[PDB]
Amino acid sequence: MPITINNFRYSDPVNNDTIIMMEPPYCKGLDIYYKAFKITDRIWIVPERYEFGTKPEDFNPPSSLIEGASEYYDPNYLRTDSDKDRFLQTMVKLFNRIKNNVAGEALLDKIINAIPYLGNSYSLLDKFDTNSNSVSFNLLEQDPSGATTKSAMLTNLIIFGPGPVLNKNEVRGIVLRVDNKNYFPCRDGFGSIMQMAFCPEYVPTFDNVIENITSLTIGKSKYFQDPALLLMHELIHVLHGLYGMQVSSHEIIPSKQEIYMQHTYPISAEELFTFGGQDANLISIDIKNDLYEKTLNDYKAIANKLSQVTSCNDPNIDIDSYKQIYQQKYQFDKDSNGQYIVNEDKFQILYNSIMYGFTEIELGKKFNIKTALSFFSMNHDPVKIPNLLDDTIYNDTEGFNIESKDLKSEYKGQNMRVNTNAFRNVDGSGLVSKLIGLCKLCIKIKNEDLTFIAEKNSFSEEPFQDEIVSYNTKNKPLNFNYSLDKIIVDYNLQSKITLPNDRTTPVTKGIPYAPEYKSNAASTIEIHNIDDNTIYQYLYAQKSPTTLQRITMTNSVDDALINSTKIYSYFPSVISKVNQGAQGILFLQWVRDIIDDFTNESSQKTTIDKISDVSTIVPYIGPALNIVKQGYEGNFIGALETTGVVLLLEYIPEITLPVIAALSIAESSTQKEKIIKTIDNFLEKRYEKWIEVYKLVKAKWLGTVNTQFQKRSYQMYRSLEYQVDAIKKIIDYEYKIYSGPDKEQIADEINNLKNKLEEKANKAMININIFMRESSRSFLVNQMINEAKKQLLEFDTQSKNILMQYIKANSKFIGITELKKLESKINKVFSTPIPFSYSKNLDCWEDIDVILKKSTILNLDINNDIISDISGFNSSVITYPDAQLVPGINGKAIHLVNNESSEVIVHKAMDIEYNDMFNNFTVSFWLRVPKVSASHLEQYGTNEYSIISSMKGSGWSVSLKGNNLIWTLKDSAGEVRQITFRDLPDKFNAYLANKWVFITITNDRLSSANLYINGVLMGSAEITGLGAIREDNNITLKLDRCNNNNQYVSIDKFRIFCKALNPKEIEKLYTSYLSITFLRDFWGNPLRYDTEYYLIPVASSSKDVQLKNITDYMYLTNAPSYTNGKLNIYYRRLYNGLKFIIKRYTPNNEIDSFVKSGDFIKLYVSYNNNEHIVGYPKDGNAFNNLDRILRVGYNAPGIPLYKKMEAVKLRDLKTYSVQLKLYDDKNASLGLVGTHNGQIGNDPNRDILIASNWYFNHLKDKILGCDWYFVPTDEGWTND
């Protein structure tokens, strides 16, 4: 099964197998040849620049660009034989990186097995044809005596080096010339050779700025992209081409009218589907249907075409072998005659896998590579990566994000502020941009800084037309997605189908013409002469001079433009202070007053009562960006109250909809009885209209309105950078001039308060991004969708009077059968509106998995040390500097210490903010509290502190008081209801004594609220007759009012459901977090190699393990306990008995620290600062000759010692136990490790440690003597 990647050097000799001389498809007949190398099955690499269709002068750098983002040119790339070897070696490493993940293995396999059809729309119907440059290329094979021989070969993909532009990779199918037109077999369903132009060293860069999640220690930062994902991106385009499903219509065109508008290339639907995420909804649902239907016709044509094939131009090709392959590829069935047909259920799955399965965003996640979340995210200048062939920079299992260099965490290997050895800037000679001038003083602006705004005529109007319903009209699926996990699962189950030999007869039919290269070169810049000040002048006015000179801040934009030393600002309190030169006073108050003024100015928030949707408004947007209304100087909030959020948009969109044509009924015939399916269809197709029009509005919003709100954030980030940079330069001049005695000592505290600026500008961007994100949403959900609802209601009322005039016309066929009188009352459904869903369609009201997913409204997960919400409503999650990460139940958990900085804040999405008020909800999470000491119960036992809460006032909270766990509701009136859980006194079996436990708190309003722990009911309280609950916007995870400075907790899998869960649903939720893959220690954390552990038997938990002597046996003895009557606590003392260490039986270089079930291991006892092996000696003493007595550090000359053990988890999934299986020399089971009562030699009676196969016949017992706790020493448990 596993895919193989060939190795070679460019100098290696031609071998007529994996290294050949190729005549490429657009050199057909010309006898031009190039050395080419077979990377794997059906994929060739040609180390040459993509020159097809070009002139030599195209490769040189132009002065300016016509369209798009920046482009790097260099004619000398890939010129020499060293350059070509560098290219070849680098592509091999990138293919190896792809193969080393199962998601990339799966992608490669689909590509390889998707062979092009031998023929197309303009070939002979009865014949497989290989004579075409669309499916075959010629090659030259030399003999010993130099005697050449023309041959040919079928293939799927050929990879070349880049065209004129190095940083713009391309994928194209072969074009055919038919009746003086271009024909593409990769768009008709047949497929063809696909040709790639790829450059691995020159990569795009992006940033962090718009994202919902934010860490105050990460800040904002630029990242560069991993070339392997860039390769996979292009490979997805190849995959579409090979299945003949390439998409060329329905492009999104940018508007170019206004100056602020971005001049990009037209965005294809191909690129939006390939990238993935939310921006694939730029193509409306109705357009997705036309595409689906087009490919279905195409594949039907091919099914009929394939059925009629009886010969081929190649004698050697077995025809039946290819037909089985094409039936496999295209997912055809056979009918009873033997002709190939399209099974539509099978087609729907195939179609969805290819278009909507593999995306850049999903591959990013599987590979742990960072990507941008939006297609409109900002691009910066590209960088280059000179050392891809250095494993200290880039390796074939982790790329840049190497764990052994602490570069996996937070994608730091890609972060440009951290991993500075991995990249270098490109030299300016070859880098060209699209710039525009703004003259008033002329300033130049990069095209990358402008705003994309879509042309209106690029969106569909098919949903406003007349749809004719009949008896036999079908439903539109409305389902265009496919899980990448499902593709991997199916890939593993595949039987290994094998391709035919790919040599064929010589190729002569094609035409050696590539389409002409379309130049992006421009001679001049577009220059605009303007009267007034736009946003770009306001930002240019904030730029500091690149020189260490006296600087000042003014509130006049024109002052700052003209005067070099002066800078524009919108913070009055900060302007006052920085201009004032502090004379005769210490810097303490001087500098502090610069900082805590900037804090007070930058942190401003407010709300507008009239706008419910927007939780956060930042008033200083207007002055910073010149967003102001006539007769509202210094009054931004007044402008928002009157106009609304549309004030923020530079381009004001036309949000009207035309008349939605009412449905018509054409099925007049009532020849057959029960023609009531015509009534069903009409009602279905009415439901489809609402979804079609809703999604069309969403598409237009994304391309036209949301893009504007995104650029506001980027603009605000630039200004906050400029302002902060000005201040950090102001403060340095007054420090250099300062000639005081304290100067040398105070230097570190000055630089300490300059980092404090960055901290508060980051806190401001959190406010700003909330503001722009929620405003954009508000404008969609209110303004734009109301216009849809108006025309959708008009559409309904009209369409009923067509429906019921048809029921009246055929009224005599449905009476006297409970059908007519039933179906006036059925039109309650027609009276009800169909609601709009901005994010996730939630259903709070039989399959337990589906009920839980469908009702989840918040769900915290940690991936690569980033906490985020994976529920579907992407709530903002803010992680503060001293929130920490520790081992969790499946990954990592949040850890909270007792200081101001240790905090995680979840600002709820606007789609869910009032779900607490009147309705039921469940809260669930994993909890780990350390065992409270004797002293700390005396001191703090009274002190109640909260750990998680949503209180303003009104809300809910989770809290701890001594060894008691407390749930607390609280309404708007002030009424309080509570549950209190008293923890068990036996701390070895207690729920709040240093183990991971699963909490679940259901709330039914018309009943009681219940507390569960590990799926078991522990407390209850009556909620009935409690007022409406009005929460805070945020949910805080923090220790609050806790006097113990040493106190800490750990929280994992925080989750909120929009219903009250029943106990069957809680049982499934609890068990779903418990896997068999990784083993666990006594505390619930992952079991580890090379770590000391005390063993306790689960069946006799009061016992410790002891050693009679070295070279001898182990046995059980009682463990001391601790007791305390007045505090009501007792337990067996931990950390007595032997220490055990687990090591790998067969060690390897690169493995994890974690012990997986099924691992083969050696076990040692650590005694007297020495590690002695545990095992069974050959023919050694055993009870009943079957229960085999274990020995520690046994060594006799002749006798062997069996020591091979397997760490496994065979029973009792809820308990943190482990079993251990001993083997002999030849993989025969000597038994699981446990105990047996008896007497060795003349010793006393003891429970001696053994290995026995007896345990295998009692694995269903409640308590069993082969289950072991592995207990490490832990800070959260010490003996009193």
Ligand SMILES: CC(=O)N[C@H]1[C@H](O[C@@H]2[C@H](O[C@]3(C(=O)O)C[C@H](O)[C@@H](NC(C)=O)[C@H]([C@H](O)[C@H](O)CO)O3)[C@@H](O)[C@H](O[C@H]3[C@H](O)[C@@H](O)[C@H](O)O[C@@H]3CO)O[C@@H]2CO)O[C@H](CO)[C@H](O)[C@@H]1O[C@@H]1O[C@H](CO)[C@H](O)[C@H](O[C@]2(C(=O)O)C[C@H](O)[C@@H](NC(C)=O)[C@H]([C@H](O)[C@H](O)CO)O2)[C@H]1O
């Ligand atoms: C009871 C006993 O002594 N069992 C030990 C066993 O002895 C053999 C015979 O036992 C069976 C059995 O497993 O029950 C009888 C079955 O019919 C046999 N099944 C077959 C052939 O299909 C089965 C097999 O032969 C073996 O499993 C091997 O595959 O053995 C036992 O009945 C017999 O007893 C008599 C005999 O009838 C007469 O000739 C004469 O009166 O004397 C003998 C000796 O008593 O002898 C057989 C031996 O030749 O042999 C196995 C060897 O694998 C074990 O030693 C087994 O003892 C058990 O060993 C395990 C692992 O070492 C634990 O030590 C068990 O201890 C615990 C436990 O569950 O962990 C400790 C608990 O504290 C204890 N609880 C209490 C309250 O006492 C339990 C409890 O005794 C129960 O047995 C639990 O089910 O045991 C230990 O019992």
Ligand SMILES: [Zn+2]
């Ligand atoms: Zn692309």
